Amino acid sequence: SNTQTVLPFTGLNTPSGVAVDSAGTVYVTDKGNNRVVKLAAGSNTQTVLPFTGLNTPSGVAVDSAGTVWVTDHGNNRVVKLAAGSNTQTVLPFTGLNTPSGVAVDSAGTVYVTDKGNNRVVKLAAGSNTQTVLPFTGLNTPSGVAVDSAGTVWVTDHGNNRVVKLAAGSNTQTVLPFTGLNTPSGVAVDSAGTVYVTDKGNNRVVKLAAGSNTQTVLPFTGLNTPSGVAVDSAGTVWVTDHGNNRVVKLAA
């Protein structure tokens, strides 16, 4: 499509991250309001998730079981809420400093960009012991995505680049994006297309697998877009942080 749609959220304040599950429910970190909200498909009425004690939440992810993970930026922690639960759980990460983005794969492994420590950390399901991924030269990494093959993509915000690390590799690859300005969020679909919010250029760009030429998505009137999600049908959702709204674009 060439015509975006604004989602019927209410009362957003600097929304920072977005996730979409297979049912088409959209989850948004409402950073300025210290809350996480969700909107079911075909609903006009949002619901505030029963998280407790959030401080400027920055990223959100959702798995196939409906569990929601949130980076609680200001409290240096990652919190989890099971579907239909009113008690969050704090994940056993150690030494986080302003975590910015989170992704979860089908194995339940959780990946977090530890922005203040210039690193990306991983926690396998049922582990109390995190692992630091062998990225090199990161500068305030901001968003993370993981595909079905276990490849991890990170927006290296301070270096104006997007890097990827194949499963079990010790050598990252820099993606051939051009003209990025403080990229802030990344998503990858099943076809391996990578979508990136180019925050400083008020645009969203995508790169097809094996392509050298990015395309700019036909969004209109973006203001410092901060997070991006993509569903199985190719619909792209973006948190338009500076306009206090979430916009979507059909394939």
Q: Which residue has the tokens 């990015």?
A: 214
Mention every residue, 6+ apart, whose C-beta is less than 8 A from residue 226: 15, 16, 17, 184, 185, 197, 199, 239, 240, 241
H or E segment and range at residue 228: strand 227-230
Query: Are 102 and 112 in contact, with CB atoms under 8 Å apart?
Result: yes
Q: State CA 169 to chain mean position distance.
A: 22
For residue 147 the two structure tokens come to: 């595909």
Could you give the CA distance from residue 242 to residue 221 in angstroms, rounded to a whole number? Answer: 10
Chain-centroid distance of CA 36 in Å reads: 13
Contacts for 127 with CB less than 8 Å, ≥ 6 apart: none
d(C-alpha 12, C-alpha 35), whole Å: 10
How many CA atoms does the CB half-sphere of 17 hold within 13 Å? 31
- Phi, psi at 78, each rounded to 5°: -120, 130
CA–CA separation, 112 and 114 (whole Å): 6
Helix, strand, coil tally for the chain in percent (to 5):
5, 40, 55
Residue 3 corresponds to which tokens in the numbers above? 């015509």
Candidates 7, 2, 1, 4; CA nearest to 246 is: 7
- Give CA–CA dist 246/166, Å, rounded: 31
Q: Which of 100, 121, 97 is nearest to 109 (CA)?
A: 121
Tokens 């500076």 label which residue? Answer: 242
Cβ-proximal residues to 6 (8 Å cutoff; 6+ apart), any chain: 245, 246, 247
**HSE-up (13 A, CA, CB side) for residue 184:** 25
Which residue, 53, 131, 36, is CA-closest to 92? 131
How was this structure determined? It was done by: X-ray
Domain 5-249: top CATH class: mainly beta
Integer Cα distance of 249 and 17 in angstroms:
16
Residue that is written with structure tokens 């399901």 in the block: 125
Question: Domain map of the chain by residue range?
Answer: 5-249
